[PDB]
Amino acid sequence: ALDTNYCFRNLEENCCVRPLYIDFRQDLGWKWVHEPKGYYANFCSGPCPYLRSADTTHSTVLGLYNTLNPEASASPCCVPQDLEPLTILYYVGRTPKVEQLSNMVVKSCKCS
């Protein structure tokens, strides 16, 4: 699958999960977050040739169409499939808050 295991162990040119570290304070301005300082949000990037992780029938038809008519720019795109939550600790004044944010980390991609 186009998940972290496969993609991270292989130098894949086509649609795959790519590593991406985001620093809360530096990158987002989320100065209130205390822990962790950053995390691997990851992202999906890469061409979507015919049949590579086609999401739907439309994805399948377009992957073929884009191959024969690459000038139309009507290609399926590499986007997240499986995501995971992230638990963070931030303060509201001097009060600690532990919260789990949903769909923060990309674990796999697909061509849609």
Place this chain on the structure above:
Amino acid sequence: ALDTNYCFRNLEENCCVRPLYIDFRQDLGWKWVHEPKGYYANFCSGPCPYLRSADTTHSTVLGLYNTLNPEASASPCCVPQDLEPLTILYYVGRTPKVEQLSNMVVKSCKCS
């Protein structure tokens, strides 16, 4: 919403549904299909600036990240949201077959 109604009536530069007609025989080689001869598969294309139809939290964080670090190329992508089936009539020999194919037409897009 970034559906056909809004997108087709407005000249939208950012992520939106775009019209795309596909001819079965000419474009796909599906010579067996008798009716319809073609259809509007449509596709999603266009930039995904901060907050435009963000699919998830990750989509939201990345839309902001991409805005400040446009060189990293870690941007959410314009992809289908709502799709619709397509009923076709094709022949197997001299026998007619009426079949409904799922997720053939794009009705709306989102930024994922």
